[PDB]
A paper describes a structure:
Methylene‐tetrahydropterin reductases catalyze the reduction of a methylene to a methyl group bound to a reduced pterin as C1 carrier in various one‐carbon (C1) metabolisms. F420‐dependent methylene‐tetrahydromethanopterin (methylene‐H4MPT) reductase (Mer) and the flavin‐independent methylene‐tetrahydrofolate (methylene‐H4F) reductase (Mfr) use a ternary complex mechanism for the direct transfer of a hydride from F420H2 and NAD(P)H to the respective methylene group, whereas FAD‐dependent methylene‐H4F reductase (MTHFR) uses FAD as prosthetic group and a ping–pong mechanism to catalyze the reduction of methylene‐H4F. Mutational analysis of four functional amino acids, which are similarly positioned in the three reductase structures, indicated despite the insignificant sequence identity, a common catalytic mechanism with a 5‐iminium cation of methylene‐tetrahydropterin as intermediate protonated by a shared glutamate. Based on mutational and kinetic analysis, evidence has been provided that all three methylene‐tetrahydropterin reductases have the same fold, similar methylene‐tetrahydropterin binding positions, and the same basic catalytic mechanism; however, the binding modes of the C1 carriers and reductants significantly deviate.
For the analysis, Mer from Methanocaldococcus jannaschii was chosen as only the enzyme from this organism can be heterologously and functionally produced thus allowing mutational analyses. For structural comparison with eMTHFR and hMfr, the crystal structures of Mer from M. jannaschii (jMer) with and without F420 were solved. Crystal structures for the apoenzyme of jMer and the binary jMer‐F420 complex were determined at a resolution of 1.8 and 1.9 Å, respectively. The overall structure of jMer is almost identical to those of previously established methanogenic enzymes characterized by a (βα)8‐ or TIM‐barrel fold. The same fold was also found in the structures of MTHFR and Mfr (Gehl et al., 2023; Guenther et al., 1999). The active site of jMer is located in a cleft between the α/β‐barrel domain and a helix‐bundle subdomain composed of five helices. Size‐exclusion chromatography showed that jMer in solution is a homodimer (~80 kDa) as reported in the literature (Miller et al., 2017). The apparent K m and k cat values of jMer are in the range of those of the respective enzymes from methanogenic archaea (M. barkeri, M. marburgensis, and M. kandleri) and sulfate‐reducing archaea (Archaeoglobus fulgidus) (Ma et al., 1991; Ma & Thauer, 1990a; Ma & Thauer, 1990b; Schmitz et al., 1991; te Brommelstroet et al., 1990).
Numbering used by the authors:
A (entry chain A), B (entry chain B): 1 to 329
Amino acid sequence: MKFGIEFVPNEPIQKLCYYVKLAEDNGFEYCWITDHYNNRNVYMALTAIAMNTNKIKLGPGVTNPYVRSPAITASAIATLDELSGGRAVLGIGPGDKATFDALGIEWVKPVTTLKESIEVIRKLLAGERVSYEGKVVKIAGAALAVKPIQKAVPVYMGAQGPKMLETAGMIADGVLINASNPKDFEAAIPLIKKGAEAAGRSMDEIDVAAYACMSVDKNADKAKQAAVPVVAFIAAGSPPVVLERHGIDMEKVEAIRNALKSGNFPEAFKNVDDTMLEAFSIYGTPEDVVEKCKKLAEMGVTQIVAGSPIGPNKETAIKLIGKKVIPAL
Amino acid sequence: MKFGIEFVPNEPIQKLCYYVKLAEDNGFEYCWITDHYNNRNVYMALTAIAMNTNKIKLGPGVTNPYVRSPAITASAIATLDELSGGRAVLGIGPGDKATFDALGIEWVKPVTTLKESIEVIRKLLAGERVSYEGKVVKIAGAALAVKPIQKAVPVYMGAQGPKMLETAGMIADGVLINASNPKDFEAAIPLIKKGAEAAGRSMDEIDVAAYACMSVDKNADKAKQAAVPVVAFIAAGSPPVVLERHGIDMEKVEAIRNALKSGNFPEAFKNVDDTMLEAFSIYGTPEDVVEKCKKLAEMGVTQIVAGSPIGPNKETAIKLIGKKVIPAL
């Protein structure tokens, strides 16, 4: 089992560089940085991280086709790959309507746009002069001067829905699924396989990654309490099918929704229950978390991403995962 | 007279960082990095430059509203300003049709779009929650979490045309004019002044920058020969009015145009003449260049940007400008 780590660049970049180097020292193999217009710029953060690291793979987790031209995304990735000596990965998903509403961007045909953007990005990274008359993406004579070090930079698709999961099976090197529980992967991974089989691919060529809420502490209950804020947001944002799959109490989900939309975070967290914590986070002592990670592997997960909060104290939790979780997996 | 320096990030970023640190050591006050999708990413380059420098102001020269959301541009600038301790500058212009044709981007109302984008970027950088119903740019509830250190990051507009120059006079902190000869500023600066007066502003609040082709060498003729390739491109791309102002031989301009569009650089360079070099570059010994810079200051130029080639050898020329040009001005 390979481990990744996820951060929002919402603190000074020097602090983030400390966390990622600490993660590298502790045997994490992937560093995923979120890409939201309101925070520190993802590629500037990744440049600093590359300068402070040596071996960990790193990239946006995830960017999207809309906030920058896919041609800009390609050369940003090539730049990262050069600086890092061949360690770049491209995490890319469809984005979200709330963001694009605020920025005045039309969310055109997200599944098609993501596929066409990935094809164009890969052709540019391969050094091709690109003429591409897509249904959405239209390129006429574009060519990079900047070149990656890797022959093919791996592309990980953010995928939550069936059509996106099947598309990832056909074209992606990895899949970032926002889930933490085996039931979710029992359902998701067959859809990826359907796409792999349609494309004549083996699942061996696809890294199925759990983009998980993780909270690890020597005290199981402190780990549980630290996962509550993130789980509140995950439950509030979960589609019906996910809430049905885990038997979540919908009246509690509505209480969380109302509290979050007025910013009453204490009130929202009051409504998180044990069912929600077991469904939407990997939490507990190291021994607890190792067992949970094993049951995800049994469903076909091949990368676990230690996502927020990581633990009650991120510094402490990164070290504890490195000493008593990663070596066991 | 303040000095800037311009680079294309078309080599490994470490080499660029050496040049910019060398420029800082030699008394340059501004560093302008070009923003084109085919090269290394401008903000990744600027991050590395910021880490290798201390005092020089730095930013894109120039970005545009189209290749990234203006909200992304705002947080990229804020991120740069934070990393650099308050040294960011935002160079921004309209872009160009050739690029946007290749990327599938419609070049909507260049002057209006640039004005609205600047207004939005400034409101975002000021910490405002932005609802902006522009003729082109439409923002609904966007807000940054990242903050610059400067209260107002200076905005320099790239401006070549009359409407853009007048707009820059009304709204910009500085103007980047792609010209090297006093005749061009004699014509341009009154248009900026027209806008400043319409907005009730003093020209004291506007840094008029000559975004110049510069070539300095202890041997005047080596300096002249090093300027030929850039001057060939400037002459080929100049609007009629500029070629008319300098009495350029249009037949040589056409020979240059045909050679460049087939990539015959030797043939294009054969057609560059003394008239073109005097009109489109600041070249010669340090003594020559000092006098030429003084005649630009007399027209109202307050920053000279040492643009490509800088000299026959960039390292040698940066040092020579620092020792025998900047101190004299």
